[PDB]
Design a protein around this ligand. Structure first.
Ligand code: CL
Ligand code: CL
Ligand code: ZN
Ligand code: ZN
Ligand code: ZN
Ligand code: ZN
Ligand code: ZN
Ligand code: ZN
Ligand code: ZN
Lengths: 187, 186
Protein backbone atom coordinates (compact mmCIF):
# COMPACT_ATOMS: atom_id res chain seq x y z
CA UNK A 1 0.00 0.00 0.00
CA UNK A 2 1.31 3.43 -1.08
CA UNK A 3 1.38 6.15 1.58
CA UNK A 4 -0.07 9.61 1.00
CA UNK A 5 -0.80 12.34 3.54
CA UNK A 6 -3.80 14.61 2.99
CA UNK A 7 -2.88 18.28 2.68
CA UNK A 8 -4.16 20.67 5.41
CA UNK A 9 -6.12 22.89 3.02
CA UNK A 10 -7.78 19.91 1.31
CA UNK A 11 -8.80 18.48 4.69
CA UNK A 12 -10.20 21.76 6.01
CA UNK A 13 -11.96 22.64 2.75
CA UNK A 14 -13.65 19.23 2.64
CA UNK A 15 -14.42 18.52 6.30
CA UNK A 16 -15.70 21.99 7.20
CA UNK A 17 -19.22 21.47 8.56
CA UNK A 18 -20.12 24.91 7.23
CA UNK A 19 -18.69 24.50 3.73
CA UNK A 20 -20.50 22.17 1.34
CA UNK A 21 -18.33 20.72 -1.42
CA UNK A 22 -19.09 18.51 -4.43
CA UNK A 23 -16.56 16.00 -3.12
CA UNK A 24 -16.89 13.24 -0.54
CA UNK A 25 -13.84 12.23 1.49
CA UNK A 26 -13.75 9.03 3.53
CA UNK A 27 -11.05 8.55 6.16
CA UNK A 28 -11.21 4.94 7.34
CA UNK A 29 -9.64 2.93 10.15
CA UNK A 30 -9.84 -0.83 10.62
CA UNK A 31 -9.40 -2.55 13.98
CA UNK A 32 -10.09 -6.04 15.32
CA UNK A 33 -12.31 -6.61 18.35
CA UNK A 34 -11.00 -9.05 20.97
CA UNK A 35 -11.53 -9.86 24.65
CA UNK A 36 -9.66 -4.78 24.06
CA UNK A 37 -9.25 -3.95 20.38
CA UNK A 38 -6.35 -4.54 18.01
CA UNK A 39 -5.71 -1.33 16.08
CA UNK A 40 -4.64 -2.10 12.52
CA UNK A 41 -2.71 1.11 11.79
CA UNK A 42 -1.44 -0.93 8.87
CA UNK A 43 -4.85 -0.37 7.30
CA UNK A 44 -5.33 3.38 7.74
CA UNK A 45 -6.21 5.42 4.67
CA UNK A 46 -8.72 7.67 2.94
CA UNK A 47 -10.83 7.85 -0.21
CA UNK A 48 -12.70 10.33 -2.33
CA UNK A 49 -15.33 9.83 -5.00
CA UNK A 50 -14.10 9.15 -8.52
CA UNK A 51 -14.19 12.04 -10.98
CA UNK A 52 -16.81 11.58 -13.69
CA UNK A 53 -15.96 11.66 -17.39
CA UNK A 54 -19.02 12.88 -19.32
CA UNK A 55 -17.06 12.57 -22.56
CA UNK A 56 -19.23 8.65 -20.39
CA UNK A 57 -19.07 7.46 -16.78
CA UNK A 58 -20.74 9.14 -13.81
CA UNK A 59 -17.98 8.44 -11.30
CA UNK A 60 -17.96 6.21 -8.23
CA UNK A 61 -19.00 7.38 -4.75
CA UNK A 62 -16.59 7.12 -1.82
CA UNK A 63 -18.76 4.61 0.05
CA UNK A 64 -18.71 2.19 -2.88
CA UNK A 65 -15.00 2.91 -3.27
CA UNK A 66 -14.46 1.49 0.23
CA UNK A 67 -16.42 -1.64 -0.66
CA UNK A 68 -13.96 -2.16 -3.52
CA UNK A 69 -11.25 -1.91 -0.87
CA UNK A 70 -12.41 -4.59 1.58
CA UNK A 71 -10.80 -7.63 -0.10
CA UNK A 72 -7.42 -5.85 0.00
CA UNK A 73 -7.76 -5.67 3.78
CA UNK A 74 -7.91 -9.49 3.89
CA UNK A 75 -10.11 -9.60 6.99
CA UNK A 76 -10.46 -12.87 8.89
CA UNK A 77 -14.04 -14.16 8.47
CA UNK A 78 -13.71 -15.88 11.86
CA UNK A 79 -12.71 -12.70 13.70
CA UNK A 80 -14.96 -9.65 14.08
CA UNK A 81 -13.83 -6.19 12.97
CA UNK A 82 -15.04 -2.65 13.61
CA UNK A 83 -14.65 -0.33 10.63
CA UNK A 84 -14.58 3.38 11.46
CA UNK A 85 -15.52 5.99 8.87
CA UNK A 86 -14.89 9.72 8.96
CA UNK A 87 -16.86 10.54 5.83
CA UNK A 88 -17.28 14.07 4.46
CA UNK A 89 -20.90 13.66 3.39
CA UNK A 90 -23.43 11.26 4.85
CA UNK A 91 -23.96 8.42 2.32
CA UNK A 92 -26.84 8.96 -0.12
CA UNK A 93 -29.81 6.75 -1.00
CA UNK A 94 -30.91 7.81 -4.49
CA UNK A 95 -27.62 6.37 -5.69
CA UNK A 96 -26.72 2.85 -4.61
CA UNK A 97 -24.63 3.93 -1.61
CA UNK A 98 -26.79 3.12 1.41
CA UNK A 99 -28.08 0.10 -0.49
CA UNK A 100 -24.68 -1.48 -1.16
CA UNK A 101 -23.50 -0.75 2.38
CA UNK A 102 -26.64 -2.40 3.77
CA UNK A 103 -25.99 -5.49 1.64
CA UNK A 104 -22.34 -5.53 2.70
CA UNK A 105 -23.04 -5.43 6.44
CA UNK A 106 -25.75 -8.04 5.89
CA UNK A 107 -23.42 -10.41 4.04
CA UNK A 108 -20.15 -9.76 5.88
CA UNK A 109 -21.53 -10.17 9.40
CA UNK A 110 -18.02 -10.11 10.87
CA UNK A 111 -17.89 -6.33 10.36
CA UNK A 112 -19.27 -3.53 12.52
CA UNK A 113 -19.43 -0.16 10.76
CA UNK A 114 -19.01 3.10 12.67
CA UNK A 115 -19.72 6.17 10.55
CA UNK A 116 -18.81 9.73 11.50
CA UNK A 117 -20.31 12.33 9.15
CA UNK A 118 -18.97 15.89 8.99
CA UNK A 119 -22.26 17.10 7.52
CA UNK A 120 -25.58 15.77 6.22
CA UNK A 121 -26.14 15.28 2.48
CA UNK A 122 -29.65 16.75 2.46
CA UNK A 123 -29.37 17.55 -1.25
CA UNK A 124 -30.60 14.01 -1.79
CA UNK A 125 -34.43 13.92 -1.39
CA UNK A 126 -34.12 10.55 0.35
CA UNK A 127 -31.24 11.48 2.66
CA UNK A 128 -33.40 10.60 5.66
CA UNK A 129 -34.07 7.09 4.37
CA UNK A 130 -30.35 6.66 3.72
CA UNK A 131 -29.30 7.26 7.32
CA UNK A 132 -32.21 5.13 8.54
CA UNK A 133 -31.33 2.10 6.41
CA UNK A 134 -27.72 2.36 7.61
CA UNK A 135 -29.05 2.33 11.17
CA UNK A 136 -31.14 -0.77 10.45
CA UNK A 137 -28.04 -2.38 8.96
CA UNK A 138 -26.41 -2.16 12.38
CA UNK A 139 -24.08 0.78 11.85
CA UNK A 140 -23.27 3.52 14.36
CA UNK A 141 -24.15 6.76 12.57
CA UNK A 142 -23.15 10.00 14.29
CA UNK A 143 -21.86 13.52 13.55
CA UNK A 144 -18.19 14.54 13.69
CA UNK A 145 -17.25 16.74 16.65
CA UNK A 146 -14.01 18.51 17.60
CA UNK A 147 -12.58 15.19 18.82
CA UNK A 148 -13.13 13.45 15.49
CA UNK A 149 -11.87 16.47 13.55
CA UNK A 150 -8.70 16.77 15.63
CA UNK A 151 -8.14 13.03 15.23
CA UNK A 152 -8.26 13.06 11.43
CA UNK A 153 -5.97 16.10 11.45
CA UNK A 154 -3.41 14.29 13.58
CA UNK A 155 -3.85 10.98 11.78
CA UNK A 156 -4.44 11.76 8.10
CA UNK A 157 -3.05 15.27 7.53
CA UNK A 158 0.54 16.32 6.80
CA UNK A 159 0.39 18.86 9.63
CA UNK A 160 4.12 18.93 10.45
CA UNK A 161 3.73 19.82 14.14
CA UNK A 162 0.93 22.33 13.57
CA UNK A 163 -1.95 21.55 15.96
CA UNK A 164 -5.56 21.33 14.79
CA UNK A 165 -7.03 24.82 14.48
CA UNK A 166 -10.85 24.90 14.85
CA UNK A 167 -12.76 26.91 12.26
CA UNK A 168 -15.43 29.37 13.43
CA UNK A 169 -18.65 27.74 14.58
CA UNK A 170 -17.28 24.20 14.60
CA UNK A 171 -19.12 23.18 17.78
CA UNK A 172 -22.33 24.97 16.84
CA UNK A 173 -22.54 23.16 13.51
CA UNK A 174 -21.84 19.84 15.24
CA UNK A 175 -24.58 20.33 17.82
CA UNK A 176 -27.01 21.55 15.16
CA UNK A 177 -26.29 18.61 12.84
CA UNK A 178 -26.46 16.20 15.78
CA UNK A 179 -30.02 17.31 16.45
CA UNK A 180 -31.06 16.80 12.83
CA UNK A 181 -29.63 13.28 12.80
CA UNK A 182 -31.35 12.75 16.15
CA UNK A 183 -34.63 13.68 14.46
CA UNK A 184 -34.00 11.53 11.38
CA UNK A 185 -33.08 8.50 13.50
CA UNK A 186 -36.06 9.04 15.81
CA UNK A 187 -38.42 6.23 14.80
CA UNK B 1 1.16 6.55 7.14
CA UNK B 2 -2.30 6.44 5.51
CA UNK B 3 -2.76 4.31 2.40
CA UNK B 4 -4.15 6.12 -0.63
CA UNK B 5 -4.28 4.97 -4.24
CA UNK B 6 -4.02 7.55 -7.02
CA UNK B 7 -6.98 7.77 -9.40
CA UNK B 8 -6.57 6.72 -13.07
CA UNK B 9 -7.46 10.13 -14.54
CA UNK B 10 -5.28 11.97 -12.02
CA UNK B 11 -2.35 9.81 -13.12
CA UNK B 12 -2.91 9.72 -16.88
CA UNK B 13 -3.47 13.47 -17.11
CA UNK B 14 -0.53 14.43 -14.89
CA UNK B 15 2.11 12.00 -16.16
CA UNK B 16 1.24 12.54 -19.82
CA UNK B 17 4.51 13.37 -21.59
CA UNK B 18 2.93 15.60 -24.22
CA UNK B 19 0.48 17.73 -22.28
CA UNK B 20 1.51 20.00 -19.42
CA UNK B 21 -0.20 20.28 -16.04
CA UNK B 22 0.16 23.03 -13.45
CA UNK B 23 1.24 20.79 -10.57
CA UNK B 24 3.93 18.18 -9.96
CA UNK B 25 3.30 14.59 -8.87
CA UNK B 26 6.06 12.46 -7.35
CA UNK B 27 5.82 8.68 -7.02
CA UNK B 28 8.68 7.40 -4.87
CA UNK B 29 10.02 3.94 -4.04
CA UNK B 30 12.70 2.87 -1.57
CA UNK B 31 14.80 -0.30 -1.69
CA UNK B 32 17.68 -1.60 0.41
CA UNK B 33 20.77 -2.75 -1.47
CA UNK B 34 21.75 -5.92 0.40
CA UNK B 35 18.37 -5.48 -3.74
CA UNK B 36 15.17 -5.81 -1.70
CA UNK B 37 11.99 -3.91 -2.55
CA UNK B 38 11.04 -2.13 0.66
CA UNK B 39 7.31 -2.02 -0.03
CA UNK B 40 5.21 0.13 2.34
CA UNK B 41 8.10 2.59 2.04
CA UNK B 42 6.48 3.68 -1.21
CA UNK B 43 3.86 6.33 -1.90
CA UNK B 44 3.31 9.49 -3.90
CA UNK B 45 3.44 13.25 -3.43
CA UNK B 46 2.18 16.42 -5.06
CA UNK B 47 3.25 20.02 -4.53
CA UNK B 48 1.53 21.80 -1.65
CA UNK B 49 -0.81 24.40 -3.15
CA UNK B 50 0.18 27.98 -2.65
CA UNK B 51 -2.02 30.22 -0.69
CA UNK B 52 -0.92 33.72 -1.43
CA UNK B 53 -3.15 35.73 0.94
CA UNK B 54 -1.79 34.01 3.93
CA UNK B 55 1.69 34.51 2.59
CA UNK B 56 2.34 30.89 1.81
CA UNK B 57 4.04 30.09 -1.43
CA UNK B 58 3.52 26.40 -1.36
CA UNK B 59 6.09 23.63 -1.28
CA UNK B 60 7.44 21.73 -4.29
CA UNK B 61 7.07 17.96 -4.64
CA UNK B 62 10.82 17.33 -4.49
CA UNK B 63 11.28 19.24 -1.23
CA UNK B 64 8.24 17.54 0.28
CA UNK B 65 10.06 14.24 -0.14
CA UNK B 66 13.05 15.63 1.74
CA UNK B 67 10.69 16.38 4.63
CA UNK B 68 9.54 12.78 4.42
CA UNK B 69 13.04 11.28 4.73
CA UNK B 70 13.23 11.18 8.54
CA UNK B 71 9.87 9.38 8.44
CA UNK B 72 11.52 6.60 6.42
CA UNK B 73 13.85 5.69 9.30
CA UNK B 74 16.72 4.73 7.00
CA UNK B 75 19.80 2.99 8.39
CA UNK B 76 23.14 4.78 7.94
CA UNK B 77 24.68 1.31 8.30
CA UNK B 78 22.84 0.21 5.15
CA UNK B 79 22.64 1.35 1.53
CA UNK B 80 19.44 2.46 -0.21
CA UNK B 81 18.36 3.53 -3.68
CA UNK B 82 15.41 5.90 -3.89
CA UNK B 83 13.50 5.95 -7.16
CA UNK B 84 11.54 9.02 -8.22
CA UNK B 85 8.71 8.94 -10.73
CA UNK B 86 8.18 12.67 -11.06
CA UNK B 87 5.78 14.54 -13.35
CA UNK B 88 7.98 17.57 -13.99
CA UNK B 89 11.78 17.50 -13.84
CA UNK B 90 12.99 19.24 -10.63
CA UNK B 91 13.65 22.97 -11.06
CA UNK B 92 16.62 25.15 -10.14
CA UNK B 93 15.49 28.78 -9.94
CA UNK B 94 13.25 27.95 -6.97
CA UNK B 95 15.61 25.73 -4.99
CA UNK B 96 14.77 22.10 -5.80
CA UNK B 97 17.95 21.03 -7.61
CA UNK B 98 20.31 22.67 -5.13
CA UNK B 99 18.57 21.29 -2.05
CA UNK B 100 18.13 17.80 -3.50
CA UNK B 101 21.80 17.74 -4.48
CA UNK B 102 22.72 18.97 -1.00
CA UNK B 103 20.71 16.13 0.57
CA UNK B 104 22.73 13.55 -1.37
CA UNK B 105 25.96 14.97 0.03
CA UNK B 106 24.77 14.91 3.64
CA UNK B 107 23.43 11.40 3.02
CA UNK B 108 25.92 9.34 1.01
CA UNK B 109 24.16 6.15 2.12
CA UNK B 110 21.36 6.82 -0.37
CA UNK B 111 21.50 6.94 -4.16
CA UNK B 112 18.82 8.71 -6.17
CA UNK B 113 17.11 7.73 -9.42
CA UNK B 114 14.82 10.23 -11.12
CA UNK B 115 12.39 9.34 -13.89
CA UNK B 116 10.95 12.59 -15.24
CA UNK B 117 7.77 12.23 -17.27
CA UNK B 118 8.28 15.71 -18.67
CA UNK B 119 11.00 18.35 -18.97
CA UNK B 120 10.15 21.48 -16.98
CA UNK B 121 11.53 24.02 -19.45
CA UNK B 122 9.41 26.77 -17.87
CA UNK B 123 12.45 27.39 -15.69
CA UNK B 124 14.99 29.37 -17.76
CA UNK B 125 17.71 27.35 -16.00
CA UNK B 126 16.02 23.97 -16.44
CA UNK B 127 19.15 22.51 -18.03
CA UNK B 128 21.30 23.58 -15.07
CA UNK B 129 18.91 21.76 -12.74
CA UNK B 130 19.24 18.45 -14.58
CA UNK B 131 23.02 18.79 -14.75
CA UNK B 132 23.34 19.54 -11.03
CA UNK B 133 21.31 16.44 -10.17
CA UNK B 134 23.64 14.23 -12.22
CA UNK B 135 26.76 15.77 -10.68
CA UNK B 136 25.31 14.91 -7.27
CA UNK B 137 25.34 11.20 -8.11
CA UNK B 138 21.73 10.72 -9.21
CA UNK B 139 20.36 8.94 -12.28
CA UNK B 140 18.44 11.51 -14.31
CA UNK B 141 16.22 9.75 -16.84
CA UNK B 142 12.99 10.07 -18.81
CA UNK B 143 9.93 7.93 -18.10
CA UNK B 144 9.47 5.21 -20.72
CA UNK B 145 6.48 2.85 -21.15
CA UNK B 146 8.02 0.54 -18.56
CA UNK B 147 7.95 3.28 -15.92
CA UNK B 148 4.45 4.47 -16.83
CA UNK B 149 3.15 0.89 -16.69
CA UNK B 150 4.90 0.36 -13.36
CA UNK B 151 3.38 3.50 -11.84
CA UNK B 152 -0.03 2.47 -13.14
CA UNK B 153 0.37 -0.96 -11.57
CA UNK B 154 1.89 0.25 -8.31
CA UNK B 155 0.39 3.62 -7.33
CA UNK B 156 -2.81 3.87 -9.39
CA UNK B 157 -6.19 2.45 -8.35
CA UNK B 158 -6.45 0.54 -11.63
CA UNK B 159 -9.07 -1.88 -10.26
CA UNK B 160 -7.64 -4.72 -12.35
CA UNK B 161 -7.69 -2.70 -15.57
CA UNK B 162 -4.40 -2.90 -17.51
CA UNK B 163 -2.32 0.15 -18.45
CA UNK B 164 -3.42 1.85 -21.66
CA UNK B 165 -0.68 4.14 -23.03
CA UNK B 166 -1.95 7.49 -24.29
CA UNK B 167 -1.42 8.59 -27.90
CA UNK B 168 2.23 9.40 -28.58
CA UNK B 169 3.62 8.06 -25.30
CA UNK B 170 6.56 6.29 -26.94
CA UNK B 171 6.95 9.11 -29.46
CA UNK B 172 7.26 11.86 -26.85
CA UNK B 173 9.48 9.67 -24.68
CA UNK B 174 12.11 9.35 -27.42
CA UNK B 175 12.02 13.07 -28.23
CA UNK B 176 12.38 13.94 -24.54
CA UNK B 177 15.08 11.28 -24.12
CA UNK B 178 16.98 12.86 -26.99
CA UNK B 179 16.67 16.26 -25.35
CA UNK B 180 17.88 15.01 -21.96
CA UNK B 181 21.03 13.22 -23.11
CA UNK B 182 21.86 16.23 -25.27
CA UNK B 183 21.65 18.34 -22.11
CA UNK B 184 23.70 15.90 -20.03
CA UNK B 185 26.14 15.62 -22.93
CA UNK B 186 27.22 19.13 -21.96
CL1 CL C 1 -5.15 13.68 -3.68
CL1 CL D 1 -7.18 21.28 -8.52
ZN1 ZN E 1 -3.17 14.57 -2.23
ZN1 ZN F 1 -22.25 10.78 -1.61
ZN1 ZN G 1 -23.63 8.17 -2.61
ZN1 ZN H 1 -6.47 10.97 -4.87
ZN1 ZN I 1 -5.82 22.25 -10.81
ZN1 ZN J 1 8.84 21.68 -10.05
ZN1 ZN K 1 10.98 22.88 -7.95
Amino acid sequence: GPRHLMDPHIFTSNFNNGIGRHKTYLCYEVERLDNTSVKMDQHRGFLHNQAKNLLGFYGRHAALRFLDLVPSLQLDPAQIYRVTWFISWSPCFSWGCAGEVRAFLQENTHVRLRIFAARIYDYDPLYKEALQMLRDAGAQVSIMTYDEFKHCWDTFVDHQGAPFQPWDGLDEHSQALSGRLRAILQN
